[PDB]
Structure formats: C-alpha cells, structure tokens
Amino acid sequence: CLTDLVNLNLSDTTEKIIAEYIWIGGSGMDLRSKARTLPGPVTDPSKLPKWNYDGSSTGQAPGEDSEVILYPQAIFKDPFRRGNNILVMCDCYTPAGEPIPTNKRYSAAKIFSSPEVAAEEPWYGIEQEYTLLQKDTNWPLGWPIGGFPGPQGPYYCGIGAEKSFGRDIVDAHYKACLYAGINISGINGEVMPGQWEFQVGPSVGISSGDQVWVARYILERITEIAGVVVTFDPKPIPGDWNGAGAHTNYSTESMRKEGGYEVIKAAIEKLKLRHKEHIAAYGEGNERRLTGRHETADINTFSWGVANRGASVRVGRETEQNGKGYFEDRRPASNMDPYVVTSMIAETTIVWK
C-alpha cells in the first residue's frame, strides 16, 4: 500500500530527479522547502537552476511584489526520497539581486571569502542540543502529562525504556545525515530526559552553517514522520532541568599547529572583550538558559576554565596537555543561527583588534 509508493525506485523508470529546495524563512528560525523535477542528476550547485517562492507566505515580501529568489548553494543526497534525488540548501535574494534582511549566509560568506580568514582556515564542530515533545500537549517526550519524571541523573547517555526517550528518531537522523553527506561526528543522550545531541564534525567556514541547517531540516522531517515535535528553545521547561545549547568548538590553522595553545588564550582574551555583543546574537531566550547552574555560565559574567563546564568557554584536558587543539564556546543557545555565530567568532578572532 502506502510505503510502497513513497519508496518506489524511479531509477528503473526514468532519469528524472527530485530536488528539494530548502530555505530559511521570515522568523530566521523556520525552515521551509518545496520540490521540483529536474531532467537528470546534478552534482554541482552552480548547474542547478535558480528558483523562486511566495515571499508573502513566509513573511519575507508583500503580496504585490511577492517573488523571492532561491540560489542553490549546497547539494546533499535526499535520505527520504533516496535514489538520485537531492536536498538543496538555499540562499535568499530579491529579484534585483539583493540579499533580503533574513539572509545571514551572505554576510557570513563574505567573511569566509576574505583572504586572511580563508588562509587561517577555520574549523567548526557545533553540538546541537534539542528537546523532543509530544504533539498537541507540547510536553517533553516520555514525560507523563502534567507531571515529571524522576529527577535528572540517569538520563545522560543512558539506555533502557525508562531512561531513554526516542532513540528511534536520533539513530535514524544519524544515518540519514551520513547518507546525505553531512559531516556528522557523533550523537548522545542529554541530561534532561527527552533531550538529545548531535555534533556536526569539524567543518570549514561557510559549509558549517550550511550543514547545520540541513541537519536541522533532516531532524525535523524525521520527527514529522514520528508524530513528535522538536524545539530548539534554549530552556523549554523551567526549574530544575537542563537547557539546550549549541556549543561551538573552534580552531584555526595556527591553533592546531605547534604552540597553538598561546593563540587559543589570545583568542579567548579577544572574546572576553566582545562578550556583550556576542551574547546579543547568540540566540533569543538565552537569558532563561545561562544562569550559572545546569552546566552553563551566567549571562552577565564571562569565564573560561580547563575541564570546566560551569564556564563560558572551555578548553579540553587533551588540547591543554598537547599545547595544541580547539576551544569550546558554550554560550550560543540551541536556536543560534550557525551562519551568524560561526562567522562572528572568526571575525572577533582574526580580523578585529
């Protein structure tokens, strides 16, 4: 019957391809997509046609001048439609060729193009945390309605029906992402029951932001299948339960070479000065998360330590002892725009003095 049709192999019948054009919508936090048929397979982003959508239905243009243009930027294999079908990550422009206010990729692209950044060859691994919720009631997966599970403790990395809610979704997403070609580096159960993580493994410049959005798209499409809701809300349940962040790990050419640990301290130092204006772009709602409790640092203070999860920045035991590595900015909230955060770290770290 129904999954027989969803999983039809089109390769046996024509050469035609399905391309799913993904973009970011008016809120800057809402993913949108639609699909077109293309005459044959494509591997190069710049050999795909540009397209348009109804900007008036995503809060990005008026009705009388409704067209917004889609620039194909990255191609990944579609894990849902399979065969030769593709997901295409997109950029948003007016018909005049201006990037619209909600296109944060443009500005970020410029920074990673800029030659003294590109030469430093920045690397990001970003750890996406998220919470799963029951549809309609909007209460965390596996929690009883109008009630709570046992207190935090057994949940982090746990196993068992009483401890681990929705591995299904998680394990599915992991494979999906790998197949798609997203550089996904790992997953893990998080502290708060119903909370989970994936990390998009060391990825260079713009492609980090690109991957992280497409990873999010795949996540939510998977939840959709499961009849479950995701939030990227930084602190979804108030009280004695963990919030969710998008820890960004970072390194430059000079940082992973000999005596990079001095360049690390130097970088952290710059970050301290601009804490104020980084917090401002590190995602909204963050005040509710960064409280100094629950493995976060207070929004108002800046700090850094070695194995310290109470800090604003953390530098692994391993990269300290090796005099070379990366550091982890724990400040960005789960609803961070990776384009914004990713480039603004490279900016406050290389260009500015």
Ligand X SMILES: Nc1ncnc2c1ncn2C1O[C@H](COP(=O)(O)OP(=O)(O)NP(=O)(O)O)[C@@H](O)[C@H]1O
Ligand Y SMILES: C[S@](=N)(=O)CC[C@H](N)C(=O)O
Counting residues that bind a copy of itself (by CB under 8 A) gives 108
Three-state SS at 265: helix
Count Cβ atoms within 10 A of the Cβ of residue 218 and give its class: 0-12 exposed, 13-18 middle, 19 or more buried.
buried
Measured CA to CA, the distance from residue 157 to residue 38 in angstroms comes to 43
Measured CA to CA, the distance from residue 246 to residue 304 in angstroms comes to 17
Q: Among residues 5 and 115, whose Cβ is nearest to a copy of itself?
A: 5
- Considering only residues 317 to 336 of the shown chain, the ones binding a copy of itself according to CB under 8 A are 317-318, 321
DSSP state of 351: I
Applying CB under 6 A, the span of 124-132, 161-169, 232-240, 273-281 interacting with ligand X comes to 124-132
Q: Do residues 247 and 296 touch, judged by C-beta distance below 8 A?
A: no
Q: Identify which of 211, 205, 286, 214 has the alpha carbon closest to the alpha carbon of residue 250.
A: 205
Q: Among residues 130 and 139, whose Cβ is nearest to ligand X?
A: 130
State the binding partner of 8 from Mn ion, a copy of itself, ligand Y, none, CB within 5 to 8 A by kind: a copy of itself
Site string for ligand Y, 286-325 (x = CB under 6 A): ---x----xxx------------x----------------
Q: Which residues of 36-72 are buried (b: 16+ CB within 10 A; e: fewer)?
A: eebeeebeeeeebeebebebeebebbeeeeeebbbbb
Candidate residues 20, 91, 120, 127; the one interacting with ligand X per rule CB under 6 A: 127
Breaks (C-N over 2.5 A) in the chain follow: none
Q: Applying CB under 6 A, does 190 fall inside the site for ligand Y?
A: yes
Strand partners, 18: 37
Three-state SS at 277: helix
Q: Among residues 45 and 154, whose Cβ is nearest to a copy of itself?
A: 154
- Considering only residues 124 to 163 of the shown chain, the ones binding ligand Y according to CB under 6 A are 129
Q: Applying CB under 8 A, does 204 fall inside the site for a copy of itself?
A: no
Q: Applying CB under 6 A, does 191 fall inside the site for ligand Y?
A: yes
Q: Among residues 186 and 305, whose Cβ is nearest to ligand X?
A: 186
Candidate residues 40, 46, 116, 146; the one interacting with a copy of itself per rule CB under 8 A: 146
Q: Do residues 332 and 245 touch, judged by C-beta distance below 8 A?
A: yes
Candidate residues 205, 209, 243, 283; the one interacting with ligand Y per rule CB under 6 A: 243
Measured CA to CA, the distance from residue 114 to residue 109 in angstroms comes to 9
Applying CB under 6 A, the span of 170-178, 249-257, 263-271, 281-289 interacting with ligand X comes to 249-257
- Considering only residues 91 to 130 of the shown chain, the ones binding a copy of itself according to CB under 8 A are 95
Q: Among residues 31 and 187, whose Cβ is nearest to ligand X?
A: 187
List C-alpha distances in Å: 298 to 19, 187, 240, 277, 288.
44, 26, 16, 15, 10
State the binding partner of 186 from ligand X, ligand Y, Mn ion, none, CB within 5 to 8 A by kind: ligand X
Three-state SS at 14: coil
Q: Applying CB under 8 A, does 59 fall inside the site for a copy of itself?
A: yes
Q: Applying CB under 8 A, does 29 fall inside the site for a copy of itself?
A: no
Structure tokens given for 280? 């401002």
State the binding partner of 125 from Mn ion, a copy of itself, ligand X, none, CB within 5 to 8 A by kind: ligand X
258 CB-near residues (< 8 Å, 6+ apart): 323, 324
Question: Backbone phi, then psi, for 211, in 5-degree steps?
Answer: -60, -50
Nearest approach, Cβ of residue 290 and ligand Y (Å): 8
The binding site for ligand Y (CB under 6 A) comprises 54, 57, 129, 190-191, 242-245, 289, 294-296, 309, 330
Q: What is the binding site for ligand X (CB under 6 A)?
A: 54, 123-125, 127, 185-186, 188, 197, 199, 201-202, 247, 249-251, 256, 326, 328
